[PDB]
PDB file of C-alpha atoms and ligand atoms in Angstrom:
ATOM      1  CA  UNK A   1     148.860  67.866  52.690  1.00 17.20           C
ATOM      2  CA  UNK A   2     151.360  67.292  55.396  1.00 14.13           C
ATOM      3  CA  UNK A   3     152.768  69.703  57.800  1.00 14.10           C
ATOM      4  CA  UNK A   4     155.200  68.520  60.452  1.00 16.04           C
ATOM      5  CA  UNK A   5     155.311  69.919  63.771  1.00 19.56           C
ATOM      6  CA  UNK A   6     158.499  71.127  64.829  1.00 19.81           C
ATOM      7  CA  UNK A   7     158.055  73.612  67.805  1.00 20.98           C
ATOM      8  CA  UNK A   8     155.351  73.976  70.670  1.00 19.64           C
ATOM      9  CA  UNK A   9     155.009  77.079  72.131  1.00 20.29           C
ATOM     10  CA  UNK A  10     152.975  76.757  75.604  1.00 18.93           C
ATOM     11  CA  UNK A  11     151.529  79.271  77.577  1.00 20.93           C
ATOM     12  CA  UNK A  12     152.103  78.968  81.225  1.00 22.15           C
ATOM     13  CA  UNK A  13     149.763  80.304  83.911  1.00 24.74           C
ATOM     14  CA  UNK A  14     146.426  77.820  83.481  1.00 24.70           C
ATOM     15  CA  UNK A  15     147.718  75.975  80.337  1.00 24.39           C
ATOM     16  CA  UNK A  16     150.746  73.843  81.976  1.00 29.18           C
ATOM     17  CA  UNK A  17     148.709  73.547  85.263  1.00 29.48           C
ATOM     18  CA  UNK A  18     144.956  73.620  85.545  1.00 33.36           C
ATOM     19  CA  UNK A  19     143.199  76.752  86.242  1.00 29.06           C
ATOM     20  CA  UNK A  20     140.908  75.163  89.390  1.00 31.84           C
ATOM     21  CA  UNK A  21     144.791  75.271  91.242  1.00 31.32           C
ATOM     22  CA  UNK A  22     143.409  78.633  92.392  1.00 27.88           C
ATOM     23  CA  UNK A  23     146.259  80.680  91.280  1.00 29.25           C
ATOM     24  CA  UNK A  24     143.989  83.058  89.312  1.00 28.92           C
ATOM     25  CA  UNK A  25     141.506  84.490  91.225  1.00 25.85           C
ATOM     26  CA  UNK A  26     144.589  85.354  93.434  1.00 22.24           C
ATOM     27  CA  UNK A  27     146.047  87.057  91.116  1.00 22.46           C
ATOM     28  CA  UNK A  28     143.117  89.251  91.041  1.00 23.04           C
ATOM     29  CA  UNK A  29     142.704  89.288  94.637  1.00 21.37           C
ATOM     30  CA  UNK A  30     146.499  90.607  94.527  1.00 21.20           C
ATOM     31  CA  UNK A  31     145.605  93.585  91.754  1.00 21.74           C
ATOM     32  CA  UNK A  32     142.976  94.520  93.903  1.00 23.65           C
ATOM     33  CA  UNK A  33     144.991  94.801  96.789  1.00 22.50           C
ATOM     34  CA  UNK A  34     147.729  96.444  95.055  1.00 20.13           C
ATOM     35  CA  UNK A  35     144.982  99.011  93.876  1.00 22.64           C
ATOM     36  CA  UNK A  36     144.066  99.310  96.991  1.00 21.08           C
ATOM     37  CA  UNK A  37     147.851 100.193  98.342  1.00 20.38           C
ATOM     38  CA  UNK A  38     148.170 102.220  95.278  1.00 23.01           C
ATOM     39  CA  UNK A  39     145.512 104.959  95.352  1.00 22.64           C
ATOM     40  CA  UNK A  40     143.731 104.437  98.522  1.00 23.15           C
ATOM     41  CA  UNK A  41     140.317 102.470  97.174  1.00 24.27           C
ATOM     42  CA  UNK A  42     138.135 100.613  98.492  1.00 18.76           C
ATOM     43  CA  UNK A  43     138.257  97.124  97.559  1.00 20.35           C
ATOM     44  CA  UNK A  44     134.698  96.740  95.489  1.00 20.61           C
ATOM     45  CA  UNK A  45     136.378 100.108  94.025  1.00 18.82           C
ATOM     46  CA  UNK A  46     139.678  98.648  93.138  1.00 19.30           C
ATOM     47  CA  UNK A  47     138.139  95.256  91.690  1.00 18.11           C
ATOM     48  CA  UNK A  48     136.224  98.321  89.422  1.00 17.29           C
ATOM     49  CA  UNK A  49     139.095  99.540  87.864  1.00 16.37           C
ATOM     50  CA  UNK A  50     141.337  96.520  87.646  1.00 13.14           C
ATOM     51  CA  UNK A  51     138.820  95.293  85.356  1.00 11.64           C
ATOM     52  CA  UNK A  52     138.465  98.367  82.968  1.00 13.59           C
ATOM     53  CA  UNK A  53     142.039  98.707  82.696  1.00 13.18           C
ATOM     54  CA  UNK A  54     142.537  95.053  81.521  1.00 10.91           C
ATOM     55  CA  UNK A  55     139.881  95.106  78.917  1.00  9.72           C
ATOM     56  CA  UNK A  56     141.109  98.508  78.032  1.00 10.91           C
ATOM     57  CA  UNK A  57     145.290  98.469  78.419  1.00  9.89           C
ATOM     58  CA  UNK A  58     145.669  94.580  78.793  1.00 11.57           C
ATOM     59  CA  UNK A  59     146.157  94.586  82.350  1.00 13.49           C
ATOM     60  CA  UNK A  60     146.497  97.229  85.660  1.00 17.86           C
ATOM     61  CA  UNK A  61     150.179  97.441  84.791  1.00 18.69           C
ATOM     62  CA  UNK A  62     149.748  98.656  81.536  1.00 19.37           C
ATOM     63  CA  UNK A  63     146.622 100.956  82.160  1.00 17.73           C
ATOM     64  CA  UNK A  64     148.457 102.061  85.103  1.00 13.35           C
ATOM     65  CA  UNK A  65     151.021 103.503  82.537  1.00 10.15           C
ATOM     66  CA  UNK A  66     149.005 104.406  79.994  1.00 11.51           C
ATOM     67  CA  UNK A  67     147.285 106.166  82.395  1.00 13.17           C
ATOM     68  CA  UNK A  68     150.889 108.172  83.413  1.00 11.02           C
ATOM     69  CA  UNK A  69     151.851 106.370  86.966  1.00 13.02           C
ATOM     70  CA  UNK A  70     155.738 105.731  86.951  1.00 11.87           C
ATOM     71  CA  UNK A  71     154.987 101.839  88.526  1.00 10.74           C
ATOM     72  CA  UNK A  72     158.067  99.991  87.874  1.00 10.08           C
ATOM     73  CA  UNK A  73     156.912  96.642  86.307  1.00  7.44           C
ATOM     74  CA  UNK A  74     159.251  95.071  89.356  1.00  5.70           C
ATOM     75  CA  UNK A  75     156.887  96.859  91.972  1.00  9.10           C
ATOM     76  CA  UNK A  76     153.657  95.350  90.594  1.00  8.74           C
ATOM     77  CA  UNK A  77     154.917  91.648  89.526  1.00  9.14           C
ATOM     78  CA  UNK A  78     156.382  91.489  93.519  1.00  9.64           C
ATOM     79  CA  UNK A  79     153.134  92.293  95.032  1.00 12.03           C
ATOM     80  CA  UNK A  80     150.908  90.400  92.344  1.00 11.40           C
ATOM     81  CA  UNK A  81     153.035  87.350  92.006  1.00  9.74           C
ATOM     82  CA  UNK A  82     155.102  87.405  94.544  1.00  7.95           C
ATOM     83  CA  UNK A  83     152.452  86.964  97.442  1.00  6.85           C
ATOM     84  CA  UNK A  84     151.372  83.857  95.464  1.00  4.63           C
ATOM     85  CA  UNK A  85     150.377  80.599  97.316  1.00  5.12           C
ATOM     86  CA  UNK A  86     153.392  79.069  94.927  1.00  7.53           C
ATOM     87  CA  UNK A  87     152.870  75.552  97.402  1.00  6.49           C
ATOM     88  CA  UNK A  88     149.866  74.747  95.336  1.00  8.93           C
ATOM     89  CA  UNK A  89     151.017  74.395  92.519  1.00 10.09           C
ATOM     90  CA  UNK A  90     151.301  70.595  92.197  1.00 13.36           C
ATOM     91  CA  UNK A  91     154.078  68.913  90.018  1.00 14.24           C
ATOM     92  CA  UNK A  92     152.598  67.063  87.133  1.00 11.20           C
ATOM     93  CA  UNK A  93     154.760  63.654  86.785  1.00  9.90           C
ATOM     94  CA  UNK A  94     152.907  62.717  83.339  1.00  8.78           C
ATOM     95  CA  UNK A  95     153.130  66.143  81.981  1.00  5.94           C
ATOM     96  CA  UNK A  96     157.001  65.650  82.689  1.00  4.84           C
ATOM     97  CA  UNK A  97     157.625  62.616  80.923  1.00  3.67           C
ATOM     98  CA  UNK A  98     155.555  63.424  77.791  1.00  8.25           C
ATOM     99  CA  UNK A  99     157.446  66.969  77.357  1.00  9.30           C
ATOM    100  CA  UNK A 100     160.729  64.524  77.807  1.00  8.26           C
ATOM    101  CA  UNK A 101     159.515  62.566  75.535  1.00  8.91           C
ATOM    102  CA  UNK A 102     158.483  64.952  72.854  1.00  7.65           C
ATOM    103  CA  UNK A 103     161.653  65.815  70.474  1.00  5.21           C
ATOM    104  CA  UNK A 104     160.030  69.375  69.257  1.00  7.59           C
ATOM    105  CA  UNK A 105     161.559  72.405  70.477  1.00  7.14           C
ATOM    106  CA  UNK A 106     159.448  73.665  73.544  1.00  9.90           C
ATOM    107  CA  UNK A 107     159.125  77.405  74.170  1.00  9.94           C
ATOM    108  CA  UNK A 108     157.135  79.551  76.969  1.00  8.68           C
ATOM    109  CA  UNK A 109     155.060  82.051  75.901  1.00  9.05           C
ATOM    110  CA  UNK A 110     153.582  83.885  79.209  1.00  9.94           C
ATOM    111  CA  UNK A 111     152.767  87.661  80.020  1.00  9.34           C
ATOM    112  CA  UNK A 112     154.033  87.019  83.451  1.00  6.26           C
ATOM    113  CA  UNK A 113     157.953  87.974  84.644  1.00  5.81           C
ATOM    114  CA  UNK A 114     160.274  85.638  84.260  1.00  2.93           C
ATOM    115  CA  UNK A 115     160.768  85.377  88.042  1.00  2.00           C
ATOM    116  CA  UNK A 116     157.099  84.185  88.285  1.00  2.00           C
ATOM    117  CA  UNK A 117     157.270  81.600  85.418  1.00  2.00           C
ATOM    118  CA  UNK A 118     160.717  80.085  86.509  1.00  2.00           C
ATOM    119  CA  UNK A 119     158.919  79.581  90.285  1.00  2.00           C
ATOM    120  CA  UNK A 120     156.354  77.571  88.356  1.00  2.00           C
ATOM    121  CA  UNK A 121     158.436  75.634  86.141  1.00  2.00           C
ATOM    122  CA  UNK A 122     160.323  74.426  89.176  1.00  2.00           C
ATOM    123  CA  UNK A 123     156.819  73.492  91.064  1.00  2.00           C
ATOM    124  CA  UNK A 124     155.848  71.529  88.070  1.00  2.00           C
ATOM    125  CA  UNK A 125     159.106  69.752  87.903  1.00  2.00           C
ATOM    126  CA  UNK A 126     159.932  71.183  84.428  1.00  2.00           C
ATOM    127  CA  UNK A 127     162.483  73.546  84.491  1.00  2.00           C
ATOM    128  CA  UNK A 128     164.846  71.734  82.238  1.00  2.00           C
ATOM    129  CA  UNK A 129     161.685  70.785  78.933  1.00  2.00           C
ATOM    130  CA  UNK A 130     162.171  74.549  77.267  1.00  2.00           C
ATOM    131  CA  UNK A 131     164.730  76.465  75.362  1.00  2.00           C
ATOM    132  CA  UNK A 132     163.239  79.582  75.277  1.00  2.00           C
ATOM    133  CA  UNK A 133     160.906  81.897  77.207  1.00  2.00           C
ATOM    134  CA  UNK A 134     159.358  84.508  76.162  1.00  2.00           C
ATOM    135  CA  UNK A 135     157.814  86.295  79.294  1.00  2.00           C
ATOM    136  CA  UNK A 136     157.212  90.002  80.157  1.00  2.00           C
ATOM    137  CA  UNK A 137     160.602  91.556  80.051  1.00  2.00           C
ATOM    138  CA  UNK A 138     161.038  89.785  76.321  1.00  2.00           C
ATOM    139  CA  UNK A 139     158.116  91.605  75.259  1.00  2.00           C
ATOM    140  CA  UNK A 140     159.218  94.973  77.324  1.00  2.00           C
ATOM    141  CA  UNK A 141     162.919  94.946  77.064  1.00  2.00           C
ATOM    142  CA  UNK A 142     163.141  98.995  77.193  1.00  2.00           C
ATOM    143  CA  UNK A 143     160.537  99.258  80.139  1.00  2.00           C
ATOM    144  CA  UNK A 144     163.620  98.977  83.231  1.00  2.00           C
ATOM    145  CA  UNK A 145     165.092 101.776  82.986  1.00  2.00           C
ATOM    146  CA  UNK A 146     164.219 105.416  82.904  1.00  2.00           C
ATOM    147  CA  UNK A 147     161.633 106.658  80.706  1.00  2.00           C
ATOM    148  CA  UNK A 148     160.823 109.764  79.137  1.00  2.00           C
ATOM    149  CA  UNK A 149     157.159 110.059  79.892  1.00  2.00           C
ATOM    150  CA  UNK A 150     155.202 106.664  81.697  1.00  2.00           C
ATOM    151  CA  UNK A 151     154.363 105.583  78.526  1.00  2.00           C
ATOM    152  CA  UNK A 152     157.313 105.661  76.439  1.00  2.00           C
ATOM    153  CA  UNK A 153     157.664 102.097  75.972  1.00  2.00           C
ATOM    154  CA  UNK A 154     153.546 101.039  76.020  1.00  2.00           C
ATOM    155  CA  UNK A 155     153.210  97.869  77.878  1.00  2.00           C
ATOM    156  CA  UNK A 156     153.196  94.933  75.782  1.00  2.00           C
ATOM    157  CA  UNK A 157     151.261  91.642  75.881  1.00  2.00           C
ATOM    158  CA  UNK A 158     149.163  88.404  75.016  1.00  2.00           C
ATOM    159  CA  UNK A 159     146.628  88.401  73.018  1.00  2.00           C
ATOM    160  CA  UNK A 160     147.999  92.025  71.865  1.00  2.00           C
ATOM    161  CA  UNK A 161     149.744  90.628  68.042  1.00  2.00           C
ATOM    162  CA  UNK A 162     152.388  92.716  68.966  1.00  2.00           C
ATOM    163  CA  UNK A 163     153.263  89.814  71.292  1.00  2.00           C
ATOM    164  CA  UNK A 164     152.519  87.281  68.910  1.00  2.00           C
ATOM    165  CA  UNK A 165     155.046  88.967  66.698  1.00  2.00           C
ATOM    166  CA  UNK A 166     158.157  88.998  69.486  1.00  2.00           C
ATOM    167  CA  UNK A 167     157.389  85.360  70.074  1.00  2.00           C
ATOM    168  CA  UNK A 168     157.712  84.724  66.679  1.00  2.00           C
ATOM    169  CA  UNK A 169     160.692  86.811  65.968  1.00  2.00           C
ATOM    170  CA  UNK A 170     162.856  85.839  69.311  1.00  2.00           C
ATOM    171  CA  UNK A 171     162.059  82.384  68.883  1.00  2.00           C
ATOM    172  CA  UNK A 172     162.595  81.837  65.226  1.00  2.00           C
ATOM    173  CA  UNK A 173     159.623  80.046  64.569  1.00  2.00           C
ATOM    174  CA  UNK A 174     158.287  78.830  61.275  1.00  2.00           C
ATOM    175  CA  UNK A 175     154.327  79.638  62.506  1.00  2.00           C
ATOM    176  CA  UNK A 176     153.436  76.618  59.545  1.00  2.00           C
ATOM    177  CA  UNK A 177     155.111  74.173  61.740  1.00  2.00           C
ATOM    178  CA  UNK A 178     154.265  75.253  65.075  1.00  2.00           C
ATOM    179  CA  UNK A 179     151.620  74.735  67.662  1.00  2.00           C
ATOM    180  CA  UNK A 180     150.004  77.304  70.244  1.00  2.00           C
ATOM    181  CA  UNK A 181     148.873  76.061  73.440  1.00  2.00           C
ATOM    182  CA  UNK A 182     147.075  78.126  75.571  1.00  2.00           C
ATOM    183  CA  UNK A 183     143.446  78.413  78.008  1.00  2.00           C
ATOM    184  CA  UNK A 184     142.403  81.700  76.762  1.00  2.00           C
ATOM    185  CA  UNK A 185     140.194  81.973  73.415  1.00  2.00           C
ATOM    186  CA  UNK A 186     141.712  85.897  72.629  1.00  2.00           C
ATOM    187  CA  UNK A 187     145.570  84.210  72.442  1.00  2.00           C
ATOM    188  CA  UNK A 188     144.055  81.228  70.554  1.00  2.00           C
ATOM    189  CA  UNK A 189     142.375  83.342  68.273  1.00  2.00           C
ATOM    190  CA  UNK A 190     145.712  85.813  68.060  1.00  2.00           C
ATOM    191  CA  UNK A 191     147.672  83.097  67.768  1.00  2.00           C
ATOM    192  CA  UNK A 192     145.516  81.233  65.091  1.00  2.00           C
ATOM    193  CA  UNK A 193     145.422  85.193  62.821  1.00  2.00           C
ATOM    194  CA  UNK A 194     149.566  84.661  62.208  1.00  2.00           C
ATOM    195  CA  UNK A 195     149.374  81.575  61.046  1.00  2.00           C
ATOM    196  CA  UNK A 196     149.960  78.782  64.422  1.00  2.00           C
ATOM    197  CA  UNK A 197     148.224  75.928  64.794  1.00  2.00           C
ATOM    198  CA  UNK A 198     146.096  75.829  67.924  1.00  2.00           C
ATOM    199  CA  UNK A 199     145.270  74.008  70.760  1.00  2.00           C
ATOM    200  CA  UNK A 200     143.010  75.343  73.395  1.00  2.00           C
ATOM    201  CA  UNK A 201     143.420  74.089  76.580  1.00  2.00           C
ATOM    202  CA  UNK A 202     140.593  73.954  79.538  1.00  2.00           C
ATOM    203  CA  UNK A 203     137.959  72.766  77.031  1.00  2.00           C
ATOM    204  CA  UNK A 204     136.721  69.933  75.494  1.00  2.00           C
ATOM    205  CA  UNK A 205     135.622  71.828  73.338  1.00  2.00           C
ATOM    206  CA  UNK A 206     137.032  74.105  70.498  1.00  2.00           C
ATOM    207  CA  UNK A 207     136.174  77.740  69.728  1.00  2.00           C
ATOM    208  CA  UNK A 208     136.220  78.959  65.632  1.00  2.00           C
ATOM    209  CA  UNK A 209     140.244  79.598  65.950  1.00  2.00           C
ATOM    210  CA  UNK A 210     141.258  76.071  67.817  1.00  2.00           C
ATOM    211  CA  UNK A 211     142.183  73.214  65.735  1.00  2.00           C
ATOM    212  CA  UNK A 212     142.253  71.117  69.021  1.00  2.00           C
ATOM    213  CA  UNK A 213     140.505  71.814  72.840  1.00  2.00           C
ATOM    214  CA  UNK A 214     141.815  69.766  75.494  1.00  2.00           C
ATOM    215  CA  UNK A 215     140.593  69.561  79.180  1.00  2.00           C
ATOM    216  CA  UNK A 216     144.463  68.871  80.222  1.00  2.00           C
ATOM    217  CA  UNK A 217     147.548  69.600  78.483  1.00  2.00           C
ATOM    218  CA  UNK A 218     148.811  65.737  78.748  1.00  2.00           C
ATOM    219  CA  UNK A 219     145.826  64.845  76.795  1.00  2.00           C
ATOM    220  CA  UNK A 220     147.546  66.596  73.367  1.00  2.00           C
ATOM    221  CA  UNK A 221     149.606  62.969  73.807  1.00  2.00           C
ATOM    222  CA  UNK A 222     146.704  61.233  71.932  1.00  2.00           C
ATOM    223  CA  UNK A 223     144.581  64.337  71.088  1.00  2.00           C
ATOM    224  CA  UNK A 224     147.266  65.358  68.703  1.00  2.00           C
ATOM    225  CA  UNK A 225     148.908  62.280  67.018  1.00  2.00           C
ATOM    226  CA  UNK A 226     150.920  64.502  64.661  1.00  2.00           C
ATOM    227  CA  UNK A 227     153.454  65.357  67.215  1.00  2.00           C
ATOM    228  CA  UNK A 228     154.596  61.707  67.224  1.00  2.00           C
ATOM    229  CA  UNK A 229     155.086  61.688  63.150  1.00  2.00           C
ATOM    230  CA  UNK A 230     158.340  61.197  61.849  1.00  2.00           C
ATOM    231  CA  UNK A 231     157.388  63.077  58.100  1.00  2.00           C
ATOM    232  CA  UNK A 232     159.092  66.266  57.462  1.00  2.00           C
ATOM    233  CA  UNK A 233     157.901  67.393  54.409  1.00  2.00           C
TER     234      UNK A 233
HETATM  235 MG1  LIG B   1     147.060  81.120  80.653  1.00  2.00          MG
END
């Protein structure tokens, strides 16, 4: 049976440029740090708690306040992000024309701020290839303001379906004729439990929920023929 394609949603951070960049484990480095501003750790035990709150809340900003600490999302994403090394991130040419060339509606799906994934957009060179983005404040819209308690409003994000589900609904997408793009295996397998088609990216090969791996996102231009086809039925 044939199911067109008409809508990619890509993640951003590791999926649109490759994870060896180096932008992750500074990340981490920065959430330690922040930790370390925050409540006075050491280091070894910031990395410690960093890591229990993102298996447990999703990341440090939501175990933070789940946890009952009043830190304003704006606080954490300008020490984590915005110390970035934003000058490695290398523009990707190919990756530029074949989003051009592809005729689907493109959408971001990241956990990160906005401010973060419009910096990286505009390193790649691609700041014009999406109509929407859904990013941190889409999926926290009530978290800016005052709040009765720290965790009014629980932080929301990837692979959480919760996510999966604002995508969906602020993007308007039909998940039968869309694709998910993304490095981690928990949003591949979220994204594959609501219905999207799935393509892993950082692999060759796929995990149970991917219908495609990829090493490099360009490579969907031949790994995934069906985005060329012209049926719509
Ligand atoms: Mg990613």
């Amino acid at each position: 049976d044939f199911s067109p394609i008409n809508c990619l949603i890509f993640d951003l951070d590791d999926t649109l440029y490759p994870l060896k960049t180096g932008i992750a484990p500074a990340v981490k480095k920065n959430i330690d740090d922040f930790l370390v501003e925050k409540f006075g750790f050491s280091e070894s035990k910031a990395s410690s708690l960093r890591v229990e709150l993102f298996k447990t809340y999703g990341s440090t900003l939501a175990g933070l306040r789940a946890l009952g600490h009043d830190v304003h999302p704006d606080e954490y994403h300008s020490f984590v992000h915005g110390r970035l090394p934003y000058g490695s991130i290398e523009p990707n040419n190919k990756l530029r024309n074949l989003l051009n060339k592809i005729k689907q509606r493109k959408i971001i799906f990241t956990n990160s701020d906005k401010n973060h994934a419009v910096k990286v957009l505009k390193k790649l060179g691609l700041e014009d290839c999406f109509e929407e983005m859904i990013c941190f404040e889409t999926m926290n819209p009530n978290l800016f303001g005052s709040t009765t308690r720290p965790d009014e409003y629980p932080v929301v994000l990837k692979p959480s379906l919760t996510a999966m589900d604002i995508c969906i609904r602020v993007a308007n997408v039909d998940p039968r004729r869309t694709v998910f793009l993304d490095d981690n295996i928990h949003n591949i397998t979220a994204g594959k439990s609501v219905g999207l088609r799935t393509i892993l990216v950082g692999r060759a090969e796929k995990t149970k929920d991917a219908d495609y791996a990829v090493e490099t996102v360009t490579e969907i231009a031949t790994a995934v023929p069906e985005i060329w086809a012209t049926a719509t039925a």
